[PDB]
Design an enzyme around this catalytic site. Sequence first.
Site, PDB file in Angstrom:
ATOM      1  N   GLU A 160     -13.232  -2.554   8.764  1.00  0.00           N
ATOM      2  CA  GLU A 160     -12.510  -1.727   9.722  1.00  0.00           C
ATOM      3  C   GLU A 160     -13.446  -0.833  10.524  1.00  0.00           C
ATOM      4  OE1 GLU A 160     -11.180   1.393   6.190  1.00  0.00           O
ATOM      5  OE2 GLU A 160      -9.808   0.937   7.850  1.00  0.00           O
ATOM      6  N   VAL A 205       0.853  -1.180   0.000  1.00  0.00           N
ATOM      7  CA  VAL A 205       0.000   0.000   0.000  1.00  0.00           C
ATOM      8  C   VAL A 205       0.896   1.240   0.000  1.00  0.00           C
ATOM      9  CG1 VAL A 205      -1.965   1.175   1.064  1.00  0.00           C
ATOM     10  CG2 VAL A 205      -1.519  -1.251   1.562  1.00  0.00           C
ATOM     11  N   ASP A 236      -0.582   4.788   8.980  1.00  0.00           N
ATOM     12  CA  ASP A 236      -1.319   5.807   8.259  1.00  0.00           C
ATOM     13  C   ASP A 236      -2.167   6.624   9.235  1.00  0.00           C
ATOM     14  OD1 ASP A 236      -3.497   4.130   8.741  1.00  0.00           O
ATOM     15  OD2 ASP A 236      -4.019   3.872   6.639  1.00  0.00           O
ATOM     16  N   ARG A 272      -7.197   2.866  -3.697  1.00  0.00           N
ATOM     17  CA  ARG A 272      -8.078   3.096  -2.550  1.00  0.00           C
ATOM     18  C   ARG A 272      -8.635   4.508  -2.602  1.00  0.00           C
ATOM     19  NH1 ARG A 272      -6.744   1.976   3.889  1.00  0.00           N
ATOM     20  NH2 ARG A 272      -5.234   3.672   3.652  1.00  0.00           N
ATOM     21  N   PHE A 310       7.638   6.792  -4.618  1.00  0.00           N
ATOM     22  CA  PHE A 310       7.161   5.626  -3.899  1.00  0.00           C
ATOM     23  C   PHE A 310       6.193   4.817  -4.756  1.00  0.00           C
ATOM     24  CE2 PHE A 310       8.853   7.472   0.028  1.00  0.00           C
ATOM     25  CZ  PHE A 310       9.198   6.339   0.740  1.00  0.00           C
ATOM     26  N   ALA A 311       5.297   5.518  -5.447  1.00  0.00           N
ATOM     27  CA  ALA A 311       4.274   4.857  -6.239  1.00  0.00           C
ATOM     28  C   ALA A 311       4.933   3.983  -7.287  1.00  0.00           C
ATOM     29  CB  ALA A 311       3.359   5.868  -6.883  1.00  0.00           C
ATOM     30  N   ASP A 352      -8.008   1.632  12.479  1.00  0.00           N
ATOM     31  CA  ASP A 352      -9.352   2.169  12.299  1.00  0.00           C
ATOM     32  C   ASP A 352     -10.334   1.347  13.099  1.00  0.00           C
ATOM     33  OD1 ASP A 352      -9.663   4.519  10.680  1.00  0.00           O
ATOM     34  OD2 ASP A 352      -9.157   3.376   8.891  1.00  0.00           O
TER      35      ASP A 352
HETATM   36  O1  LIG Z   1      -2.916   0.034   8.950  1.00  0.00           O
HETATM   37  C1  LIG Z   1      -1.725   0.469   8.935  1.00  0.00           C
HETATM   38  O2  LIG Z   1      -0.922   0.435   9.913  1.00  0.00           O
HETATM   39  C2  LIG Z   1      -1.216   1.095   7.622  1.00  0.00           C
HETATM   40  C3  LIG Z   1      -1.926   1.359   6.446  1.00  0.00           C
HETATM   41  C4  LIG Z   1      -1.023   1.949   5.487  1.00  0.00           C
HETATM   42  C5  LIG Z   1      -1.105   2.436   4.170  1.00  0.00           C
HETATM   43  C6  LIG Z   1       0.013   2.973   3.505  1.00  0.00           C
HETATM   44  C7  LIG Z   1       1.233   3.022   4.200  1.00  0.00           C
HETATM   45 BR1  LIG Z   1       2.827   3.742   3.329  1.00  0.00          BR
HETATM   46  C8  LIG Z   1       1.383   2.561   5.502  1.00  0.00           C
HETATM   47  C9  LIG Z   1       0.263   2.028   6.155  1.00  0.00           C
HETATM   48  N1  LIG Z   1       0.098   1.499   7.435  1.00  0.00           N
HETATM   49 MG   LIG Z   2      -8.097   2.185   7.679  1.00  0.00          MG
END
Ligand SMILES: O=C(O)c1cc2ccc(Br)cc2[nH]1
Ligand SMILES: [Mg+2]
EC number: 2.3.3.9
Length: 715
Positions: free
Chosen positions: A422, A117, A621, A328, A125-126, A450
């Site tokens: 979530e 993700v 995130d 997303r 990064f992408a 979440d």
């Molecule tokens: O749920 C997490 O800890 C989490 C989601 C997510 C999405 C993108 C990036 Br880069 C890091 C992340 N951690």
């Molecule tokens: Mg979430």
Amino acid sequence: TDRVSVGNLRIARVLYDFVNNEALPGTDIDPDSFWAGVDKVVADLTPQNQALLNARDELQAQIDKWHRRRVIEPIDMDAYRQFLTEIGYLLPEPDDFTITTSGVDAEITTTAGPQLVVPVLNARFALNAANARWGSLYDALYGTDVIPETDGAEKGPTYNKVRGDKVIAYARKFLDDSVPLSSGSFGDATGFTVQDGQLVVALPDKSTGLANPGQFAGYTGAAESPTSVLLINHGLHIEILIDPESQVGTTDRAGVKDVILESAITTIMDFEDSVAAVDAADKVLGYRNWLGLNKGDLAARVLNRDRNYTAPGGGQFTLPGRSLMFVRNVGHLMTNDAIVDTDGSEVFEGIMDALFTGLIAIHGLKASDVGPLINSRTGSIYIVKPKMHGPAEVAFTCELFSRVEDVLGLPQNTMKIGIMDEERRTTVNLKACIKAAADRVVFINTGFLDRTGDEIHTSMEAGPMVRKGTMKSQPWILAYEDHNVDAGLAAGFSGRAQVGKGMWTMTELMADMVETKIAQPRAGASTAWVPSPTAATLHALHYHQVDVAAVQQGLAGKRRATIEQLLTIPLAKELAWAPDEIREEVDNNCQSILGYVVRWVDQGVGASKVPDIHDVALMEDRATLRISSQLLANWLRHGVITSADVRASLERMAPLVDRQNAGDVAYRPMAPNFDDSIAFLAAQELILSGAQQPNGYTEPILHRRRREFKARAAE
Ligand SMILES: O=C(O)c1cc2ccc(Br)cc2[nH]1
Ligand SMILES: [Mg+2]
Ligand SMILES: [Mg+2]
């Protein structure tokens, strides 16, 4: 202003131009039909979008009051469950069914593996993510603590032969475990050759074939002295690169240069919790990167092309060189001023994301310029939809997708849904949520942040909750994890859709990841989230050690969680914590809020390696804000801490965060002038207004504070 009038909408010019000049050309959609569709879809679906958000508040209000009139120690599960059923929170379970989702790619239906993700707003990064389909195992081993930095095996300026030798041995062992020889070990291999379509490995004493020759998948170079050998195990490729003249190859018994693993099978380009996007400018930057990935022309580095191989018998073939992309979208809550209506009301951002990311996704279904089509050969657009609450909200997204497909000229159900589990109202009606999307669903998944945030806010009035660390092992969450897998399996996900689990946040703690993250495929998850290409390569090991397809067949029919366990509120017992424990927890939560918030508000960064209070790098995130601020709001709500305790912790933590960030050229200190830092003030607001935010959501406050910062930086 500089907006564009389209029916009842006033569209930001930067967005209108982006769409006209960049997104639209090449799709054969009439520009004015698209825009008329935008206006129409927004006018039609906005009222239900709003009604659904009102429904959340109404249910929460009723639960708040339920707890407020209780004064009773434990919980009458029977009455509480009866209550949830009366108010329409807990809906009836539907009869058994099977999902009908069609036109989906092999990476999603059948292949189990790591899923990356990445913030779509960060082009570098992408691109790395999309290229992370194939990754060097040696690099992932030599570069992290998976090979421990003990005496003599440390990473220095230049190559450690001692350390690299352990790297080789580790990979040799993995080969023996994953693609076993008929006799002997890869550790004593001297060469590789192909004779009569069979892999032949040379040992010092004799030769041998694979125990299962069907795992030999191909090769490159001459059959008699190959440049590499391609193997397969559990649907995932392993390529042994042969080059005696490379730095590592020279030192190697068989001349092996590297082991390349198929790693990040899919990637989620994220417009939600990992990015900061509070206006038209930010959305366009994101939308433009998403366009560049789908057109295949994004450059910051460039996208990789497919990999050519020679089949065991001599024919030519190709394997995909890129992670298959999901996007997303944001969820149902927020509006964004990228479009406002006649009254100046902002438009729902979720509705906008579906129209624009969907539009943009059309390019990934067609030949690039930089070349064959980048993404879905089966003709699907893969949208992850976060933060939904219950079946009617899933149906609303399905109906949104349905209307967009028309505007886009796409066949119905082209836009597939990745259902995030979530929110608690989704968890306890998960089967209905899957059913509501039975012809569009391509995954479900679970997380921690979440979901725990919603858990706390929902039962906010019940009493003091356990600590954040404690939550990870609570009965509600262990049951939630299992229930998710069970529901997917029962709806026929095996061989049809992904069953995913959460992120490993500890980016430097790769030894612990390899050691512990294996629990996820063992629990029957066909995928799980990783924070980096490097992590994707290491987590791939887990899919070689564990036959996910076999685990899922064995789980069939089982119901390992009850509605009671799901509904078990994580209330702290009486006398749970010493004073020092209370402070540490408060410090822990204030630190994560401040450390994350400062970079979000001041620099528009939504994900990064943030040092926690004990200096461990975490890659979390925005949901880290939701859980933390909800836990402090819960403790403040029930007398565990004072507002002065909260004040003290922020003051005590702000200089530490300041210190952990220098560090950064653009960083502006928070201490000692706290009420002059919009970021510091945001952190304070999140905690102190936390109990009043809808379902504990942080975006309303965070977005407002980020806009405020942007406005000040411009004067
Ligand atoms: O749920 C997490 O800890 C989490 C989601 C997510 C999405 C993108 C990036 Br880069 C890091 C992340 N951690
Ligand atoms: Mg979430
Ligand atoms: Mg506790």
